[PDB]
């Protein structure tokens, strides 16, 4: 999967967003076991606090959009993050929820990535959990050339393989 779809790396700084805490924590544990590096947000990127993210979301890395996150929140966060220069790779985790259905979220993410001027400067990785409900989403990711993985630990392992190779 990685050799087929992932864009070559220009660095080793990682950013993570999720619609839940525990998957992000599992990702962090896997990253720690392999001596990886987390990215640090800049003060100016605090446009996130203003940009319609509700007041109860804490602005840091990993960025935990809560269980009730909607697709619009994803799109706004993606735009703001892509217009910055604070990281070299971006991990996007999605868990099953009523507010953000899998197929629609995948479609909006694909379009947002397609239309962004600075998309070709970073490497995207997706991890959509839930075997039954994410089949069509994974198929759509495949046709657009974006890599996708089954579990967060696998995603971290795939990223660190290329980091170590370089």
């Amino acid at each position: 999967e990685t050799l087929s779809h992932m864009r070559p790396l220009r660095g080793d700084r990682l950013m993570i967003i999720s619609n839940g805490a525990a998957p992000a924590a599992l990702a962090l544990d896997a990253l720690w076991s392999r001596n990886g590096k987390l990215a640090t947000l800049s003060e100016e990127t605090c446009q996130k606090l203003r940009d319609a993210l509700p007041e109860h979301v804490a602005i840091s890395n990993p960025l935990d959009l809560r269980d009730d996150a909607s697709s619009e929140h994803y799109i706004k966060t993606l735009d703001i993050l892509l217009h910055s220069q604070d990281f070299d790779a971006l991990m996007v985790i999605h868990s099953p929820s009523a507010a953000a259905p899998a197929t629609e979220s995948a479609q909006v993410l694909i379009e947002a990535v397609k239309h962004h001027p600075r998309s070709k400067y970073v490497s995207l990785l997706t991890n959509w959990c839930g075997e039954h409900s994410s089949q069509e989403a994974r198929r759509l990711f495949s046709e657009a050339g974006l890599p996708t993985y089954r579990t967060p630990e696998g995603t971290i392992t795939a990223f660190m393989h290329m980091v170590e190779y370089r």
């Binding site: 525990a22 924590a25 962090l28 544990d29 720690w32 269980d67």
Partner: protein
């Protein structure tokens, strides 16, 4: 404390829904739909001042108007009404309640109110519970379930939804599925004691982040594992994860030693969890 009192939560004869709504995007709407589709043998009583009927079921304007005392109640409302609604429920005579949302500065008042009326509460910010053999689906989850012989206890909603979806893929079922939330009143050791005696359960799987009473947990697990196998996954082994989860206090080798001493076994990652299922 008393194992008497969990009967109302796990084998209720009637349920009341506070805040049921006709709006498709509301939490009360989803809970009402799930309960009606579950296959329950008792009545489902909606309570709300904004609708005369919900999904074809006659409604009642307030708690005091109910025709009799419900066994179990669910709050689907803003946190600012919690204490008043709880007091009304206590006056009516209900003994078990599920709470959707609450800040951390409310815990002491909630505990005092619950003690005053001899009521048990399932942790605030809880996803709910499912009991297929009773045809009961009192949860805010969008994933269906089927009957089985495996029981699962979780302190995380996302993991619960993920495991339910995996089970749906493989055509597999459960005997009990319980989400703890913040574990303010009901906790893991009592549920282990209860499940050790359930005739439909033959194995237990747990996902945990923190504990409050170590000796009771150790004793309950040791007693329960004499006749049924039990596996556990525990996250937060690194400083960044501990900061994210607000569990910086403690040490992980202590968890390793405690798990070993009670006769359990620890699994390492997500893949091993699916394989364990």
């Amino acid at each position: 404390m008393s194992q008497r009192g969990l009967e109302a939560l796990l084998r209720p004869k009637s349920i009341a829904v506070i805040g049921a709504s006709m709006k498709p995007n509301r939490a009360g709407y989803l809970m009402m739909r799930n309960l009606l589709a579950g296959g329950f043998n008792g009545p489902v009583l909606p309570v709300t001042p904004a609708w005369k009927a919900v999904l074809g079921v006659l409604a009642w304007p307030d708690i005091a108007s109910l025709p009799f005392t419900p066994d179990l109640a669910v709050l689907c409302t803003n946190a600012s009404r919690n204490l008043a609604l709880l007091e009304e429920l206590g006056e009516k005579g209900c003994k078990t309640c599920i709470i959707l949302s609450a800040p951390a500065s409310q815990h002491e008042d909630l505990r005092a109110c619950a003690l005053r009326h001899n009521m048990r509460l399932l942790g605030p910010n809880s996803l709910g519970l499912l009991a297929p053999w009773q045809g009961l689906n009192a949860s805010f989850s969008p994933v269906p379930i089927k009957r089985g012989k495996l029981a699962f206890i979780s302190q995380s909603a996302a993991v619960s939804n993920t495991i339910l979806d995996w089970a749906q893929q493989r055509k597999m079922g459960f005997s009990y599925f319980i989400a703890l939330g913040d574990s303010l009143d009901i906790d893991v050791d009592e549920l282990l004691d209860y499940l050790a005696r359930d005739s439909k359960t033959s194995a237990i799987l747990l996902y945990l982040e923190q504990l409050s009473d170590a000796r009771r947990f150790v004793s309950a697990a040791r007693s329960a594992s004499r006749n049924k196998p039990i596996l556990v996954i525990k996250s937060g082994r690194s400083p960044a994860a501990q900061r994210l989860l607000n569990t910086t206090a403690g040490m992980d080798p202590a968890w390793d030693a405690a798990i070993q001493r009670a006769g359990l076994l620890r699994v390492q990652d997500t893949h091993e969890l699916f394989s364990a299922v």
